[PDB]
Design a protein around this ligand. Sequence first.
Ligand SMILES: CC(=O)NC1CCN(Cc2ccccc2)CC1
Length: 123
Amino acid sequence: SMEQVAMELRLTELTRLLRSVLDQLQDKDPARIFAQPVSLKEVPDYLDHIKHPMDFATMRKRLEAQGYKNLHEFEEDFDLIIDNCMKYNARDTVFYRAAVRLRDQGGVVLRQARREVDSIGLE
Ligand SMILES: CC(=O)NC1CCN(Cc2ccccc2)CC1
C-alpha cells in the first residue's frame, strides 16, 4: 500500500540518520577498541561475564538491515558497548577509560540526533 511505502521511506531516512551517527560515534574510538566483537578465542570466558555482547560492527550489520526501528533501540546497543566494557574492565585500564571518553563524547552526538529524529518526525 502507499502507507507501507511511506513507512519504509521513513525507516530509510532514519537509517540514513543513524548511519551518520554511527560514523560519528566510531570516530570517537580512534583506537578502535569497540570496532569488533570481543574475541572468544582471546577471552574464552567472556560470555560468563557479559550476557549481551555488542560492538560497532554488529550495530552496523543491524543498521544496514534496517533493524533499528527508532533511535531508542540504537541507543540501547550503543549503551551496551559502553556498559559491558566498564564492567568487564577495571577502572584503571585503557579499556575502561576509552569507554568513558566514548560515552561522554558520544552523548553530544546523541543529544542532537534525538532532536533531529523528533523534529523531522522519523519515528
Ligand atoms: C570491548 C572489550 O572489553 N574489549 C577487550 C578489553 C580487554 N581485552 C583484553 C584481552 C586481550 C587479549 C587477550 C585476552 C584479553 C579483552 C576484551
